[PDB]
């Protein structure tokens, strides 16, 4: 049943007749987190992410798609040094028009208590008017409140 | 510990290898 759904996805990757292959990967990834909420070796997540990126790599039509960004962000969280992934996306122009990119990037710096670089990431996202801008600005404001709270 | 985590730079290298 788990077995059956995984097999169905694997066959869909092969036989998909549409023009948006990211859809198959995106549904396969989200079924996988729906069904393995705290991960596990049986989830196959990290290998699924690697396979998804490998299949869609260099597909620039997707560089601004949030499902694409998602694959990379999920992959990055499973890397020894998530900053390598953020900088990569940044160099390649993947996700650079999305607020979520800057939010997650800024969050990684905030988690290490590198508040100054977290702030700079927000500032760049905002200058680029990354979307949605109001969500990005709201998120920035609350990042600032968290820092203030930690310095009283 | 590194153990099970992905090596990002290695991954990117692997993609280029074909």
Author numbering:
A (entry chain A): 54 to 205
B (entry chain X): 208 to 225
Copy text from the publication:
The multidomain protein kinase BUBR1 and its paralog BUB1 are central components of the SAC. BUBR1 also associates with unattached/incorrectly attached kinetochores and plays an important role in kinetochore microtubule interactions. Blinkin is a central component of the KNL1/Mis12/Ndc80 complexes (KMN) network, the multiprotein macromolecular assembly essential for the establishment of proper kinetochore-microtubule attachments. The interaction of Blinkin with BUB1 and BUBR1 connects SAC signaling with the KMN network and is essential for the recruitment of both multitask kinases to the kinetochore (revised in Bolanos-Garcia and Blundell, 2011).
We crystallized and solved the structure of human BUBR1 at 2.2 Å resolution in complex with Blinkin peptide in the form of the chimeric protein. Although we had previously been able to obtain a structure of free BUBR1 (D'Arcy et al., 2010), the peptide-bound complex proved recalcitrant to crystallization trials. However, the aforementioned biochemical and biophysical characterization of the BUBR1-Blinkin interaction provided a rational basis to design a chimera construct, which comprised Blinkin residues S208-K226 linked to N terminus BUBR1 via a poly(TGS) linker. A comparison of the crystal structure of BUBR1 in the ligand free form (D'Arcy et al., 2010) and in the complex shows that BUBR1 undergoes little conformational change upon binding Blinkin and preserves the features characteristic of TPR motifs, including a concave inner surface and a subtle right-handed super-helical twist of the entire structure. Electron density of the Blinkin residues N211-G225 was clearly visible and unequivocally shows that the side chains of Blinkin residues I213, F215, F218, and I219 form part of a short α helix defined by residues F215-T224 that runs parallel to the long axis of BUBR1 TPR1 and TPR2. Remarkably, the BUBR1-Blinkin structure revealed an unanticipated protein-protein interface in which Blinkin interacts with a shallow hydrophobic groove located in the convex side of the BUBR1 helical bundle. The structure indeed reveals that the interaction of Blinkin208-226 with BUBR157-220 is derived from complementary hydrophobic interfaces implicating Blinkin residues I213, F215, F218, I219, and L222. Polar contacts contribute to stabilize the BUBR157-220-Blinkin208-226 complex: salt bridges are formed between Blinkin residue R221 and BUBR1 residues E103 and E107 while hydrogen bonds are established between BUBR1 L131, a residue that is located in α helix A of TPR2, with Blinkin residue I213. However, the structure reveals that this Blinkin region undergoes a dramatic disorder-to-order transition upon BUBR1 binding, a feature also observed in TFE-titration experiments of Blinkin mimic peptides monitored by circular dichroism. The micromolar binding affinity of Blinkin S208-K226 peptide for BUBR157-220 (9.3 μM ± 0.4 in 1:1 stoichiometry) reflects a relatively moderate interaction.
